[PDB]
């Protein structure tokens, strides 16, 4: 099972860049979803979850089908919110329907990421949409009530090792949990790419309490939450060690992300040795934009 990139016909750099700079505008535009969060943690989201369907022993899943498209995975449980991520993109896919729908889902997560002034992600065109039958079955994505040894395995199926995993959960400064999408409640939420997940779990004062859905989760008086698996990454010594590296080196933080981030849009894609170099969009900010 290989998946060969395979770049849409005719297609440089400069039609990306216009597909990132209509997201991006869009991200701006509209402000008012979800009190005013905007909608970049959820794209963020979303082309987190179309990517960590893959299986590195078989090769199914991942980001390269645009399977996410389909009802069987539209409808994981697991996926319950990204329907707003996917109506955000859906304007966009018209006014450049050239895309394929996994190259457009993944980079409206790189454009979420750099407009909310997080690190360049260098993102890859190629993606080529699959037919409905390759569409991974639910539950493959992780859950959030488990413990630190869960999240390592968890995570060796999409061959991402420690310190992948801690960066990559940093992504959870982003935005908020809700209620009816996953049983968990929300606290403060930012819509600013930093390393504030790692000084908030080592500086806040936590406590365990049982929330309305019945489960459970991490509080503080502040006003913040964190899942249990995000928690574990204080509990286990190694991933608390790599916390504290992030939660006291910015840089160190962004250009680990960067390149877990990349790596994990890309799972499961074969490029060819004389596929395009990654590209690096620029931000509307850098274009005046
Ligand atoms: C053990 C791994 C993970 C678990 C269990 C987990 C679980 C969750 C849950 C329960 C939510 C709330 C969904 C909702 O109620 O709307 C959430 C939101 C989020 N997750 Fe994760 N997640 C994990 C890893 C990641 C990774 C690796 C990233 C990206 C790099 C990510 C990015 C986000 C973002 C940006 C949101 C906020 C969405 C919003 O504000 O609508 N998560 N995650
Ligand atoms: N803002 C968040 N803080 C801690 N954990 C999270 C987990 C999922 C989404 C948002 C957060």
Redesign the pocket.
């Given at each position: 099972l290989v998946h060969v990139a395979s770049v849409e016909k005719g297609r440089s750099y400069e039609d990306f860049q216009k597909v990132y700079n209509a997201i991006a505008l869009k991200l701006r535009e509209d402000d008012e979803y979800?009190n005013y969060?905007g909608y970049g943690?959820?794209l963020?989201?979303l082309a987190?979850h179309i990517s960590?369907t893959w299986d590195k022993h078989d090769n199914t899943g991942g980001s390269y089908g645009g399977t996410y498209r389909f009802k069987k995975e539209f409808n994981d449980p697991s996926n319950a919110?990204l329907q707003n991520g996917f109506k955000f993109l859906e304007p966009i896919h018209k006014e450049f329907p050239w895309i394929s729908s996994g190259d457009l889902f993944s980079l409206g997560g790189v454009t979420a990421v750099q407009e909310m002034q997080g690190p360049k992600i260098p993102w890859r065109c190629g993606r080529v949409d699959t037919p409905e039958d390759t569409t991974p079955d639910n539950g493959r994505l992780?859950?959030?009530d488990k413990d630190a040894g869960y999240?390592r395995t968890?995570f060796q199926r999409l061959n991402m090792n420690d310190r992948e995993v801690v960066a990559?959960?940093g992504?959870?400064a982003?935005?908020?949990?809700?209620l009816k999408?996953?049983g968990?409640e929300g606290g403060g939420?930012n819509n600013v790419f930093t390393n504030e997940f790692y000084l908030n779990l080592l500086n806040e004062d936590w406590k365990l309490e049982k929330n309305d859905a019945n489960n459970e989760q991490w509080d503080s008086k502040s006003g913040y939450m964190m899942?249990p698996?995000d928690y574990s990454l204080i509990q286990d010594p190694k991933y608390l060690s790599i916390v504290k590296e992030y939660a006291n080196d910015q840089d160190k933080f962004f250009k680990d992300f960067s390149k877990a981030?990349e790596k994990?849009l890309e799972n499961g894609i074969t490029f060819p040795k004389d596929a395009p170099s990654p590209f690096i969009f620029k931000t509307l900010e850098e274009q005046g934009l």
């Amino acid at each position: 099972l290989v998946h060969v990139a395979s770049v849409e016909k005719g297609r440089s750099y400069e039609d990306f860049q216009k597909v990132y700079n209509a997201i991006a505008l869009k991200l701006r535009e509209d402000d008012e979803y979800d009190n005013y969060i905007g909608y970049g943690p959820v794209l963020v989201r979303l082309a987190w979850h179309i990517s960590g369907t893959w299986d590195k022993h078989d090769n199914t899943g991942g980001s390269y089908g645009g399977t996410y498209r389909f009802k069987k995975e539209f409808n994981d449980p697991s996926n319950a919110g990204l329907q707003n991520g996917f109506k955000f993109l859906e304007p966009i896919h018209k006014e450049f329907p050239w895309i394929s729908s996994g190259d457009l889902f993944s980079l409206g997560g790189v454009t979420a990421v750099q407009e909310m002034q997080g690190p360049k992600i260098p993102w890859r065109c190629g993606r080529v949409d699959t037919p409905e039958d390759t569409t991974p079955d639910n539950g493959r994505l992780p859950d959030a009530d488990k413990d630190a040894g869960y999240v390592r395995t968890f995570f060796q199926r999409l061959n991402m090792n420690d310190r992948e995993v801690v960066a990559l959960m940093g992504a959870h400064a982003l935005g908020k949990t809700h209620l009816k999408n996953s049983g968990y409640e929300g606290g403060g939420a930012n819509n600013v790419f930093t390393n504030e997940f790692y000084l908030n779990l080592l500086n806040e004062d936590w406590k365990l309490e049982k929330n309305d859905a019945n489960n459970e989760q991490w509080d503080s008086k502040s006003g913040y939450m964190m899942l249990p698996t995000d928690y574990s990454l204080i509990q286990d010594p190694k991933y608390l060690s790599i916390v504290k590296e992030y939660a006291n080196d910015q840089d160190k933080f962004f250009k680990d992300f960067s390149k877990a981030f990349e790596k994990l849009l890309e799972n499961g894609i074969t490029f060819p040795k004389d596929a395009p170099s990654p590209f690096i969009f620029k931000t509307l900010e850098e274009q005046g934009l």
